[PDB]
Amino acid sequence: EYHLMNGANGYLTRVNGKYVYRVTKDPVSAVFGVISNGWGSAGAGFGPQH
């Protein structure tokens, strides 16, 4: 086939996209962001969202 026709490794490549979305949604990603950023809310962001 040809990539122009439909695109080789198109849907397969996007498979990782779903995993990324789930990871971002999870609080784990937020932790990496807060820790990496080095800036804490110390008010609302800090602790449970509630």
From TrEMBL:
GO terms for biological process: defense response to bacterium. GO terms for cellular component: extracellular region. Keywords: Plasmid. This is Prepeptide GarQ. It comes from Lactococcus garvieae. The chain holds residues 21 to 70 of 70 of the full protein.
